Amino acid sequence: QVQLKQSGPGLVQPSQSLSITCTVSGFSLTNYGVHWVRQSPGKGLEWLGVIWSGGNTDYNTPFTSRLSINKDNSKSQVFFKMNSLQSNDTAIYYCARALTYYDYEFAYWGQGTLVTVSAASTKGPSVFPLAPSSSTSGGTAALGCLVKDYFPEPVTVSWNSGALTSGVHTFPAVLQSSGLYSLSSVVTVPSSSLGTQTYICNVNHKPSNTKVDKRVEPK
Amino acid sequence: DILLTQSPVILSVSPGERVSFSCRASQSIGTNIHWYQQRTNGSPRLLIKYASESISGIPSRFSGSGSGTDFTLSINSVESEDIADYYCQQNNNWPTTFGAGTKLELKRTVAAPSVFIFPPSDEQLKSGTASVVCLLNNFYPREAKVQWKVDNALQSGNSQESVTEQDSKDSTYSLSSTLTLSKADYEKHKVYACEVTHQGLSSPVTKSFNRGA
């Protein structure tokens, strides 16, 4: 199976450099070109450039000066580096692969790397329980986790290590007046299962290496 | 660079209906157009290549047509799982460029929210801040009002809302309203209420609790 797995989300100081690794599998870098595309609020989808099978590169006109793409065939790795980032470079960066070696119809994509250009410093979140009580209606209970005061985005949240997905709602993060993000993630479950079952939100905030599991119980 | 103009910017339709996406090019580009689908938290997914050619594992309900400057992506009979943003891409001229996209929203019947309220945890109060959360779950349409009252005093300016995108299965939204108070303020009051207004409710629904059990 063709896969492109990118490195984790990052914070970049203004005028400093962005580095992303694309690690591929299911095909050889000697047989396909790897493209880089970003997606920003201000410019939407934007093709940045490519490193071809034989190692040549093309860069989109406005990035020729500050962009460089390299690779290690034997390690299946593509290295993307862009210089002197400014705030409007804040975006999700993707590596992608086309159907055929020479073409540009992108059939396969990396999961994306969210990059934040900001002078602010990394800060991990605190996790508080949103505890159910009688949060009970028609035999359904709701519970959750409040993931508060972190920077930058994103945070990932699952329930019971991926085992619980039905009823789960993880809200878009909102930026608070303190310049820190905050979000909740909730799930509805049968009232009667609060006795038997354990409910744990798995919070991960990679930019600060904050990895927390929160057990949420009735109070 | 070729400019690609997608229209409209947003489309609302019911399941089983036909929907067309338009992509117009600032000059002729033959059939050198590709289409993508992007779901919430997802990467673009290749739907059609070269105006009309099928892609492996893409449902037959997706098709495309057009040549020159005017292109169309069709979904003959929309499903709830089709909620996404749709983009076109040209590669007749270097560099390849993408359109701004069209947002696909789905219509469904009115659903009242189920409402839930959560007091701040004892764990958080240790940090001098109290967050009170109100959950509006699985409702439609998107428009909703949350009113906070603390001891009958109407709250203003100290709450924030977040809304999920449409659910891929039932097409509903959910919303969180977070009321943020200092610990000192929280401790000086008893009745914390969350009043919810929505087209699905014949009257506002209030959820509340008294601080300290």
Binding site: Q39, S40, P41, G42, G44, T90, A91, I92, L114, E153, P172, A173, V174 | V9, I10, Q38, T40, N41, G42, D85, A100, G101, K103, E165
Partner: peptide, 12 residues
Amino acid sequence: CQYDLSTRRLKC
């Protein structure tokens, strides 16, 4: 419309 990095969808 424009892409929203928090919601990861277009926002209109």
